[PDB]
């Protein structure tokens, strides 16, 4: 119940939110480092920085002065240096030649009772520096205390996208040698854009020298009383409570115990008596990967949207776009289009998902007929010229074309269908020059009474209104079949990781699963397969041409029995599809019933009334 910080800067009031980021595991086996003079345990080792270090320090004389972040620490790669001497707080980013045992020296005088820093042995030299920060000067105490620990300092560090985030909060404590248990939400302090890769880091301490420590510089010194702890950051799901003040007072875990995971799904801090699904063996994801085809050619969107001429309304041209990548942002940010109402797709999700093929249809039509392009419309255009189905995917693009498509006189170069005896089918184009008839007598191609041409010319005069102006319309029709996609949006392509619960992004779909080798043979024109439960369990991976079966990290289906949070924290866990290894823990008092295997509960030979249903006639109760 420690190390909880603020994941986002969004102000939340009386709401519960579940986030996914690099958090500290609950009740973890943190490393203990001790430094007591008495003996002479001046431990400042080099330990890896996997994804984040939670630092817990119990200080009473300010013996910790700074920290060193870097990769090699041999003046070969850029390193981050933070230090807090007796004057300022200096943060510099250079390529330092670090010593084997860096330290800071404080000297004490017997003649006059005063403490002043004397030795500063951290780095040898610094050649190239990029970032430097110097704080305001101040005076520190630096006086030794004969009492116990009084000040507790907690630090959490993260390195995401080259950004260094430091969270700190000071809380007074009164202990001797223990970790103070309590909830204290850490607040953001300073974000440093170092942009360096950090793999190992080392703790820096201080040295005390006086007349009571004879010898040379390497032996005439003492250590005093100090203690600090180090905890790693693991990507796990958590639930945080935000009150009206905005400070987190308590939180629950979703990966520590099966009883804790009940609070995560219920989204509450109190668990009532009942049955919860929870998980069988849930492993939290540690990475996110994406996979997309290696196509890098740009789609010919310039030809469609900047054609020298546009087709007629009835004889609208159709263009097929494939074998490229299409970016939907450069057309959106053109600040020239006038129609962007889309059905079934979203501008934000247009760069994530893709389809089998993309169709382009270009014609010119008026604004009152631009709004008639929508599938739920009828009229001379929406029923006789162009029909879209009710399940149409995508949208059309229209923009003002007052400069073009107009002459000094009437521009009669574009026509449209006016007369038709039947409703047009969706996605159908008709070019018929037959003489339309309305009378009972047949028409032999003459232009007499009740015999008129179905095509009607358009008057595109420059003096018409805004709604009567000719607007260039481009129709994008997205179709997604079971065939492999040949065109997809522009996204990155990461590597492949096996036998781990990882986040996979295959051909626009994302989720959680484990990538494993598969022996199945798949027909070429099918990409994805599904099981009986209609769940995705196979990907094609066209980059490597290897079939990977999606393995669920935890299938669930595990009963958890809780007598009550107010009563006791002990819970009973029953596994349905497990016959009594796939458990959270073996525990004790393992009992096997017809409905499943029960652990954590004692089986008796008596028969009382049913308190909570378990299954197959089995009942359990909380007794003495």
């Amino acid at each position: 119940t420690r190390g909880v910080y603020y994941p986002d800067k969004v102000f939340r009031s009386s709401v519960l939110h579940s986030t996914q980021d690099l958090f500290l595991p609950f009740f973890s086996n943190v490393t203990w480092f001790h430094a007591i003079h008495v003996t002479k345990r001046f431990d400042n080792p080099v330990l890896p920085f996997n994804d984040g270090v939670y630092f817990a320090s119990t200080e009473k004389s300010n013996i910790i002065r700074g920290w060193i972040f870097g990769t090699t620490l041999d003046s070969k790669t850029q390193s981050l240096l933070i230090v807090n001497n007796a004057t300022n707080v200096v943060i510099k980013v250079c390529e330092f030649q670090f010593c084997n045992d860096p330290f800071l020296g404080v000297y004490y005088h017997k003649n006059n009772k005063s403490w002043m820093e004397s030795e500063f042995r951290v780095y040898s030299s610094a050649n190239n520096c990029t970032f430097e920060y110097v704080s305001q000067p101040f005076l520190m105490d630096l006086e030794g205390k004969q009492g116990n620990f009084k000040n507790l300092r907690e630090f959490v560090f993260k390195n995401i996208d080259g950004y260094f985030k430091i969270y700190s909060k000071h809380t007074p404590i009164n202990l001797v040698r223990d970790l103070p248990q309590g909830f204290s939400a850490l607040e953001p302090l300073v974000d440093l854009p170092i942009g360096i890769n950090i793999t190992r880091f080392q703790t820096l301490l201080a040295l005390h020298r006086s007349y009571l420590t004879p010898g040379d510089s390497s032996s005439g010194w003492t250590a005093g009383a100090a203690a600090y702890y180090v905890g790693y950051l693991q990507p796990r799901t958590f639930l945080l409570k935000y009150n009206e003040n905005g400070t987190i007072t308590d939180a629950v875990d979703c990966a520590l115990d099966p009883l804790s995971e009940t609070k995560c799904t219920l989204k509450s801090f109190t668990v009532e008596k009942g049955i919860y699904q929870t998980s069988n063996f849930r492993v939290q994801p540690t990475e996110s990967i994406v996979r997309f085809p290696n196509i890098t050619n740009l789609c010919p969107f310039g030809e469609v949207f900047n054609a020298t001429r546009f087709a007629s309304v009835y004889a609208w041209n159709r263009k097929r776009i494939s074998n490229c990548v299409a970016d939907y942002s450069v057309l959106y940010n053109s600040a020239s289009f006038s129609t962007f109402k889309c059905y079934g797709v979203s501008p934000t999700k247009l760069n994530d998902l893709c389809f089998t093929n993309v169709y382009a249809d270009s014609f010119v039509i008026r604004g009152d007929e631009v709004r008639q392009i929508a599938p739920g419309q009828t009229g001379k255009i929406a029923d006789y010229n162009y029909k879209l189905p009710d399940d149409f995917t995508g949208c059309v693009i229209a923009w003002n074309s007052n400069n073009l498509d107009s002459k000094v006189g009437g521009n009669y170069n574009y026509l449209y269908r006016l007369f038709r005896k039947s409703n047009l089918k969706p996605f159908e184009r008709d070019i018929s020059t037959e003489i339309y008839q309305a009378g009972s007598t047949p028409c032999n191609g003459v232009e007499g009474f009740n015999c008129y041409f179905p095509l009607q010319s358009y008057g595109f005069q420059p003096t018409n209104g805004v709604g009567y102006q000719p607007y260039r319309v481009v129709v994008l029709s997205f179709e997604l079949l079971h065939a492999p996609a040949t065109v997809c949006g522009p996204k990155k392509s990461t590597n492949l990781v096996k036998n781990k619960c990882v986040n996979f992004n295959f051909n626009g779909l994302t989720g959680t699963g484990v990538l494993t080798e598969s022996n199945k043979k798949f027909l070429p024109f099918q990409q994805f397969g599904r099981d009986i439960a209609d769940t995705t369990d196979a990907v094609r991976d066209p980059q490597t041409l290897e079939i990977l079966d999606i393995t669920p990290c935890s299938f669930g289906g595990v009963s958890v029995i809780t007598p009550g949070t107010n009563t006791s924290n002990q819970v009973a866990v029953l596994y349905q599809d497990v016959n009594c290894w796939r458990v959270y823990s073996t525990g004790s008092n393992v009992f096997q019933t017809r409905a499943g295997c029960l652990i954590g509960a004692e089986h008796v030979n008596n028969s009382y009334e049913c308190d909570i249903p378990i299954g197959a006639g089995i009942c359990a109760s909380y007794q003495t």
Partner: antibody
Amino acid sequence: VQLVESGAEVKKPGSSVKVSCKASGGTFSSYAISWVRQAPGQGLEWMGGIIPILGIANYAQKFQGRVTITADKSTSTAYMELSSLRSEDTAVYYCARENGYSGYGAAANFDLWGRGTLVTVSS
Amino acid sequence: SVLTQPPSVSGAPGQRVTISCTGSSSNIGAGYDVHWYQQLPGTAPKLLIYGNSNRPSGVPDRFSGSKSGTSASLAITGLQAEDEADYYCQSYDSSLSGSVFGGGTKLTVLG
């Protein structure tokens, strides 16, 4: 019906030609009339087409605004007036009669053709 | 002549000859159909197959055609002495904004 064109025409490198495609046994009705050329050793191109019931012409991208096609509806005769002749243009010309239909394709098919007008350039 | 056609093909009186006309996705690979034309050496061309499944009047039953994907086929049941002609495939082009013909193929059966 049948389509009757003119005879062989000989012109100059930089003159103007004017051929006609008359109709015998019936008028053009309301079907659009197109013009298709054919060069020896090459394929068939498409200069453009005319709608006789409205007098509207739709040209191609390869042929610029130097050739104008006109079709008189009363006499049922189309024209292929072209200017700035070049020695490459030694092809014959046919007047094509399109026949539309209903379907997902909507590709124009030339049902009735002409008989050819051999236009040659000789300085 | 953007649509691809073989320069020349060979046939025999009694076998089957298949001619493939594959073009770009904007004209052939799109929804537009194909129209086959037969041009005798000395006679104006005439429409052979329209709509990819229908046959106009005067067209013998030996001429058949089909379309699948981005290709067109011209299947002829037997080859006669009058079959020595150039065959062309015509389809509507969206980029060209006009109808265009194929490159043409030569079918010579003589000895």
